[PDB]
Amino acid sequence: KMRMATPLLMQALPM
Amino acid sequence: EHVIIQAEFYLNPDQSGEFMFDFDGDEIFHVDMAKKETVWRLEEFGRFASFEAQGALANIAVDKANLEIMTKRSNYTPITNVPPEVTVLTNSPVELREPNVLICFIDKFTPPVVNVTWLRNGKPVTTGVSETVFLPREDHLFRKFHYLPFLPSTEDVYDCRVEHWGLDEPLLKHWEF
Amino acid sequence: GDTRPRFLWQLKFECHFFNGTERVRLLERCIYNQEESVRFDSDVGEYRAVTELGRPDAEYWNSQKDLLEQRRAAVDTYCRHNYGVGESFTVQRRVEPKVTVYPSNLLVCSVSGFYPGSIEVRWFRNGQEEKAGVVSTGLIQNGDWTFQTLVMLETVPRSGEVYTCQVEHPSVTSPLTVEWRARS
To answer: N or C: which end of chain B has fewer CB within 10 A?
Structure first.
């Protein structure tokens, strides 16, 4: 049946 | 208070999906499905942050599976058309010979499909125009901006035409100096 | 000419922030067509049907213990994380207004190009704040991470009068001011 989509992550760029 | 929304959708039959991040009503970015890449709303943002686009393709694949399940469970109950309010305005107050931007603001509508055309002097412009993706709202309707850079003049006139299945006839929206 | 039926499914993870990242609330919303059918509120820690159509999903998803735990962790793993990754160009964003005055019987104060949207705009006639007669456009998102607004003042001016629009916004220490007198 219905599946859970995933909370996704932005990431910090090496500065 | 701040609010960060991860908003995803899938629409059938059109077979269109969307994946974007919202900060206080402004798009941080979205993922272009065709090109399978991340597009930042302001190129600057891309200097500080990265986002694996492939992530969104997997979410969209799930959203699509869910839509089909849900379509059936509803007994194939379709979405009711809600036509947009369209309004035209400029970046700044306009003075001749100073480059400004026309904005076509399309608000409070569903589903997320619209045909938007800019017209300079009655003819269709497609060069320099740009647009946002479909932006989320509390009431689960959408909104959207189209942009057109221009050089203000008395010689020229403009219209923004908007087609949506919830409108009897296209909305024309006029602007002139 | 396309009248085919449309079917829409929307998934929204809402991260709500109070006092920096002091209080975070996660709100996952499921919407079919225009009807939110089921949600997970972090305040609750479980899925709840919003309507009948969502009942099967809440019951079923609530039975997946490993995934539920992961959702309860989301305030830290997901919201607070993204808050930090992105906070330096969103929350810290400041872009200064641009002010212009001009007649439209009616004086207009255009204030544009600014960010964030919390702003203060006030009229003065010969040094005394004018409040009656003031109508406004409200706040306006341009969708490009800037706002704008028009604050109108209704008046008939005797010449030699100096009306003044003053604007206050977190981007600038000193209130911006613009003067406008009529001519004979």
So the answer is: N
Output the six-digit token pair for A3: 């599946």
Angstrom distance (rounded) from CA C132 to CA C142: 29
Q: The domain C1-92 is classified under which CATH number: 3.10.320.10, 3.40.1390.20, 3.40.50.300, 3.10.450.50?
A: 3.10.320.10
The H or E element containing residue C182 is: none
C residues 69-128 near B, CB within 8 Å?
Answer: 79, 82-83, 85-86, 88-91, 98, 100, 102, 110, 112-113, 116-117
Domain with residue B107: its CATH number is 2.60.40.10
Could you tell me the residue range of the domain that residue B55 belongs to? 1-78
Grouping H, G, I as helix, E, B as strand and the rest as coil, residue B54 is helix
Q: Is C153 left (phi over 0), alpha (psi -120 to 50) or beta?
A: beta
Task: Classify the phi-psi angles of C112: left when phi > 0, otherwise alpha if psi is within -120 to 50, otherwise beta.
Answer: beta
| Cβ within 8 Å, pair C31-B13 | no
Resolution in A: 2.7
